[PDB]
Amino acid sequence: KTHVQLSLPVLQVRDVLVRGFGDSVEEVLSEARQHLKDGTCGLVEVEKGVLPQLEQPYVFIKRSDAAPHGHVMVELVAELEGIQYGRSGETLGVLVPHVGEIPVAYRKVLLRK
């Protein structure tokens, strides 16, 4: 399927144990997509002071369209030293590995895969 319904655990930035997916734009997009498939991906909502507490390159989920079955359609955009790789809509948050942190909420998304 071109899209997959996922329910992403929303994590507090200070709880996150593994603060990024790797060391290059290509690696972080690769690893984010693998963790999304494996159900091992969390979401951190972006506010003042969040991104400097995480590791670059960043992987964002961004709204790709204006919401089947409650699931917002999203795609992945990576960022490294102020350059983004991809073009999409509003940020829903930054993706991180999930390794058992307790979430505060779930974000229903339809991921363009």
Distance CA 95, CA 78 (A): 10
What is the helix (H) or strand (E) element at residue 48, kind and residue range? none
DSSP β-bridge partners for residue 79? 58, 84
Sign of CA dihedral 107, 1, 90, 69: negative
Dig out the tokens for 82 from the structure.
């102020």
Residue 78, CA distances (Å) to 21, 105, 108 in order: 11, 23, 20
What is the helix (H) or strand (E) element at residue 41, kind and residue range? strand 41-44
Q: What are the chain's domains?
A: 3-112 (2.30.30)
Q: Which residue's entry shows tokens 């003042």?
A: 48
Distance CA 82, CA 113 (A): 25
